[PDB]
Assembly symmetry: D3
Homo-oligomer: 166 residues x 6
């Protein structure tokens, strides 16, 4: 499987690096998409190479989507192409993993009304206003959508997402 | 004229300091309310003293409210007492100034349905989902609510807010 | 009303941003002059665009001068052209606002003998040795010269400077 | 199964956080041991709670050992008790995972003579002088010892370590 | 000989550490005096232990004085006791070494009128207004006063100061 | 006399700057060699110009060698040319000063068997495994090799090294 990550500068470092390596362990191919080629730097200073830009992503070529948190989702959600990628993959029923501020991209895509999930508690009212049935749990699984809240939930977040990709 | 500020650590420094001094120029008494007494530190490292805690605020004692941005509103909006202060003052028709992420507190208060305003563009979809008629302008004035987007709007933000307090 | 600012990297962020927006509120045109075009960054990391270089400034084209503090004045005062701009505008009786280390430029211009004002207390002995009658006050107004000491004085500093430009 | 981590301040953040969550996914109990109770902070600023001090560790109570990298191993290897824990667990054939500078603790334990493994390439000559058959590979498995070199190897490092704990 | 250093937080790190070790090489005893006991931290993050406070210094007990630069001299020069120590030792003809912003303390002591020396070029006009015959040289020796400008002058600064202490 | 320094980014700032100026005081020519031309930055942010690259160094042209510490030696010791320079100069009996992690380069050169010296205590076991008779002292002098442990030893380190160059 080809797993796409939508992110940008000021991503929450462990929320990108943890699923990146956890999914590589399974033999899945992992791709970082962002605004431009080169590198992006997390809140804590970890640097990662960008594999492709949002403009070059064909959503049909990717099988699963991961949305790390941090401050990057508020930048990503203003890019119409990045939001279109998330709208298409999520609405087609492809596996989507979000954590922390990651689901702000799904709010902007207009795909969460009636869906059950979680997020960083600081944006729960925004998830509720987007029609989410918000749950305070380390991991929520709602069909193709696997959601978690904070870095302390990483173990449970990918435990459930890896099951979805099997 | 007693102006209350609702804020916390990681406030956007100039969005707190600019209205604080602009309103002191007019002879208004300015008060910083936060989670605990002592000091709070902005994103850029400026420190300010907390005058009172959210639990000690009686909203009837304050005439106007300022909501600076940064990452502080996502912490403030999880405090039921801080949200109740903003709900009471805004719903009473008292002057309320918000900028950048500041209106996340008003979203949580449930007072923005059908109101017209702006915010940091990164949360415009959350403002729209809360019932705001969102406008991309340096300053919007909707009755008692004066809203702006980013630090570049400071001059226009307080130019309009000062007129409401006269 | 064209207001010129003489500054450089490591300016005290709020001492530049506060008067910039306060004077824009009045409808005055504000200009940042520095060593080179592009951007300059304050002590706390705020970035601002440089409008023109010291070499391109014709002091006859500007009506008032603002001298923010920080570590920038110690760099600015070594530039003969920047010091000549401050000498000409101050000695012509045009309104000049200084705060914190800002008057180090006026010391270098040789215009403060027998004038009354203030500064960051750490350089009061240097102001006294330049012939200033130094006062420990949040704001001092001596004809065209409006001086303040530290960021806590911002409200009083521009309250008096705005009156001079009216 | 109880997994012990030996670490200190300036640990490489992802080298501690990644195996911590990867092993919690399997249902293993994970324990952070360091010099004192309270918290320790990684090179990149992530902070983690210390579960117990080196003096309180009884090696017989733990089933497996993880040695993250960063600058922490050079501090840990000067603590005779921490080195004795690593010596006892490694020499008893319990699973031991090391990455980056992590095996400096095993060098100090005197247990690597005639063993095959890897490390951060910057200390390969020190591993060779301790009697290691050094291999430049993302992961090496030598009986109970699973070793990796850098953060890019995380996926392979725990892929092999998890197999040892099954 | 007992060499006293007058300094505080935000000292220029190499300007304190270099003379400290260079004078210890000669067998001189070296003492750091500051506002309070404990430690002080330089601009670049080096930490040094404070040996005694300004209040506990008896200038008669010290044979030579060193004044490092950085931002510390602007804090030190506001302390009447620290300025009195520098006034007494300098006016008694004891060896005094200054570099960079270090001579701001001697300006405040009122001992430089007619003396020949140098400093950080950014404060040369303040040295001139204090009556200094200012020279642009890596090191100036004027009787008991050895002065230098910047970190690049360290080699020449202590080359001359060590000769004075022989 | 020409003194060569082998170093890189993340050198311990005072361990490079202190011997650089101490040896310039004696009139010796000092040269910084690193991976590329331009500048290198220490752990604490001091920046120094690189005089020449490792590939351009002819060991016959230099009379003495300095090896500062920090994290730079673990990068330098992976460059076969930099290790060959240290090997050639040390094995020819030219004066060699090392401090802290600096002797990791000599370990990699294979020249320390049966030699007496010291280092940062965190790598003493690696020095012992390289055949060093390790001593816990502020300075050790073994023929041409002058070694010290930490920044607190600077005064003693160059006191002994300067005697070798006379
Ligand atoms: Tb940011
Ligand atoms: Tb934060
Ligand atoms: Tb600076
Ligand atoms: Tb460190
Ligand atoms: Tb052997
Ligand atoms: Tb400072
Ligand atoms: Tb590093
Ligand atoms: Tb042997």
């Amino acid at each position: 499987m080809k797993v796409l990550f939508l992110t940008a500068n000021e991503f929450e470092d462990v929320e990108l690096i943890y699923p990146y390596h956890r999914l590589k362990e399974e033999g899945h191919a992992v791709y970082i998409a962002s605004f431009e080629r080169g590198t992006i730097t997390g809140k804590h200073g970890y640097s990662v190479k960008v594999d492709l830009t949002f403009d070059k992503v064909n959503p049909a070529e990717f099988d699963a989507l991961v949305l790390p948190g941090g401050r990057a989702p508020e930048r990503v959600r203003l890019n119409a192409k990045a939001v279109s990628i998330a709208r298409k993959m999520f609405s087609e029923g492809k596996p989507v993993a979000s954590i922390c501020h990651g689901p702000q991209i799904l709010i902007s895509a207009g795909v969460l009304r009636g869906r059950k999930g979680t997020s960083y508690p600081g944006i729960k009212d925004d998830m509720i206003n987007a029609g989410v049935e918000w749950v305070d749990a380390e991991v929520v699984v709602d069909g193709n959508w696997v959601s978690s809240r904070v870095p302390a939930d990483l173990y449970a977040w990918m435990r459930e997402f890896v099951k979805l990709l099997k």
